[PDB]
């Protein structure tokens, strides 16, 4: 009706969805930082949703 967007930029955000899932290196990279390997990486896919989407 009005706020009909998302299929124009999708990548812009999808990139962080993959990223979030390509960032959880709870092993090695996050050798013990597990608790945050997760949270940390999820806030990415989510921050993205505020840079590409309006909802």
Swiss-Prot record:
Substitution effect: residue 17 to A: Complete loss of toxicity
Localisation: Secreted
Record PTM Hydroxyproline, positions in chain: 10
Keyword annotations of the record: Disulfide bond, Hydroxylation, Ion channel impairing toxin, Neurotoxin, Secreted, Toxin, Voltage-gated sodium channel impairing toxin
Pfam families linked to this entry: Toxin_13 (PF07822)
Outcome reported for the amino acid change (mutating residue 22 to D): No change in toxicity
GO MF, any single term: toxin activity
Protein task: This toxin increases the excitability of nerves by delaying the inactivation of the voltage-gated sodium channel (Nav). Only acts on some crustacean. Is more abundant, but 15-fold less toxic than neurotoxin B-II.
Name used for this protein in its record: Neurotoxin B-IV
């Amino acid at each position: 009706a009005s706020a009909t967007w998302g299929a124009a930029y999708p990548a812009c955000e999808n990139n962080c969805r993959k990223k979030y899932d390509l960032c959880i290196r709870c092993q090695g990279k996050w050798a013990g930082k597990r608790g945050k390997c997760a949270a940390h990486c999820i806030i990415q896919k989510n921050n993205c949703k505020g840079k590409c989407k309006k909802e």
